[PDB]
């Protein structure tokens, strides 16, 4: 799938052909639109001193 074809918001559903289920299932896999872009904030949490005592 082209990169430009995914950002346009198209319905890409896959189908299966199995003998147990006569009716194929459809799974809607589409990227939701209208969302915003937020800069992620990375924080590092050092381990507490209560764990280093156990060694």
């Amino acid at each position: 799938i082209c990169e430009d074809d995914w950002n346009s918001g198209e319905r890409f559903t896959c189908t299966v052909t199995h003998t147990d289920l006569p009716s194929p299932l459809k799974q809607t896999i589409s990227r939701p639109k209208g969302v915003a872009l937020h800069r992620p904030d990375v924080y590092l949490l050092p381990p507490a001193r209560e764990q280093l005592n156990l060694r």
Partner: protein
Amino acid sequence: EMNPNVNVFVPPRDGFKSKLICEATNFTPKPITVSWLKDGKLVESGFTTDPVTIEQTYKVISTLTISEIDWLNLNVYTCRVDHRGLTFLKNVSSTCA
């Protein structure tokens, strides 16, 4: 002049490439045209026509070569029968669908 009885058989539920038989017994006169369809589209090749036998009535059958993958995906195989200008259609699908 009587209307032929169109009957299309289906493969068993517990498995069986299978074949499709469209019987048109108890029909008159002897000439009869039998074709096959696939999801509303014409079929070029992949089927044969057995010679008409004698059961006065006759017996005409047709064999279609299909696949297991293309049969359990909600596909309609209509047996179009043209008899004395009358087009007979029989839409079939999966019983367990």
